[PDB]
């Protein structure tokens, strides 16, 4: 846990708590997509959380090997529970960037929104959000454009930022 | 919204988003305990969230007048969504201090835990937590003792801190 402590916002005792919990509740030593889906389907039982769970699982699976090891699980938790707003937004951008190419296109945003609406149990609004986010009008939202609009003081962007914070 | 902006972590445009949302979804201009219970019963449908909702409502109702005005709603949200860990812990202490006397006794902690377990759908563990938290052994947990143990590096306290963060 020494290296993990040095790489995350957790002390060794916090990592021992997470580790013990991880070894008990998840014996294979990794979190598979099936587990993510179960965790979210339990919590959002009155909707279909499978797609969102899928994107979320891919967000945790940084190596894209289909297996979230303890190290990956803690790294994500470190950011989500204790990272700066800057780190949290970057983690979120990477969640929306489905195919992990470093860009978010309108379809991808559309898929993310539908996955969220499916979880909570549309198009028009997204075309409005995407247009405001794609600053240079070239059909792709880069990390820099994402950071800017998701921290800018514009009523529409503020609305979206609030939803994302609660999300 | 000028004074509110000066008193919270929200800019005027963020407050306009919250205000518009508040005027639509909650026409009386205040949030009554019945609304809090409905909001939480919806989100945690497979359990009884009424008691927790009750303590939470009392936490928002700082004036203890039985009515959460927009100002009170935003003040709480400011802390929960953007306050420092110090401010968030103080807000939380006040949530657990059911009778608002500035002290948390074992019964109160017991009630809070049961309300949470009821929401998620016991005694022994709480007697262990309370004992570790009441530093001077006088049967009451003050804000200072709460802050200390809920920021200290002890495996049991770390376990509890994690649960509270996720809670």
């Amino acid at each position: 846990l020494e290296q993990l402590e040095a790489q995350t916002n957790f002390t060794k005792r916090e990592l021992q708590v997470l580790y013990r919990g991880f070894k008990n509740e998840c014996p294979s030593g990794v979190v598979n997509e099936e587990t993510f889906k179960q965790i979210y389907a339990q919590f959002f039982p009155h909707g279909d959380a499978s797609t969102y769970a899928h994107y979320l699982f891919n967000a945790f699976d940084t190596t894209q090997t289909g297996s979230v090891k303890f190290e990956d699980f803690v790294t994500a938790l470190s950011i989500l529970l204790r990272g700066t707003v800057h780190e949290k937004l970057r983690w979120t951008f990477n969640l929306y960037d489905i195919n992990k190419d470093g860009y978010i296109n309108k379809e991808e945003m559309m898929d993310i929104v539908k996955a969220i609406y499916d979880m909570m149990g549309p198009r028009q609004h997204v075309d409005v959000f995407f247009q405001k986010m794609d600053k240079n009008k070239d059909g792709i939202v880069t990390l820099d454009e994402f950071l800017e609009s998701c921290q800018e003081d514009d009523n529409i962007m503020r609305s979206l930022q609030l939803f994302q914070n609660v999300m | 919204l000028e004074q509110l902006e000066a008193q919270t972590n929200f800019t005027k445009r963020e407050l306009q988003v919250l205000y518009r949302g508040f005027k639509n979804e909650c026409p009386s201009g205040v949030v009554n305990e019945e609304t809090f219970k409905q909001i939480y019963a919806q989100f945690f449908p497979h359990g009884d969230a009424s008691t927790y909702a009750h303590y939470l409502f009392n936490a928002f109702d700082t004036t203890q007048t039985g009515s959460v005005k927009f100002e009170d709603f935003v003040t709480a949200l400011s802390i929960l969504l953007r306050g420092t860990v110090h401010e968030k812990l103080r807000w939380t202490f006040n949530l657990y201090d059911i009778n608002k006397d500035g002290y948390i006794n074992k019964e109160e902690m017991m009630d809070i835990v049961k309300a949470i377990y009821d929401m998620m759908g016991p005694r022994q563990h709480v007697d262990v937590f309370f004992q570790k938290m009441d530093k001077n052994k006088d049967g009451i947990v003050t804000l200072d003792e709460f802050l200390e143990s809920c920021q200290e590096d002890d495996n049991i306290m770390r376990s509890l801190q994690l649960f509270q963060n996720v809670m």
Binding site: N24, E25, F43 | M120, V128, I156, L162, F163, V166
Partner: peptide
Amino acid sequence: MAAGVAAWLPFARAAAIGWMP
């Protein structure tokens, strides 16, 4: 983001109960 985190409440509760002898 809070909703995504909140889903891990069962795990959190289990992790805490795992240290209470």
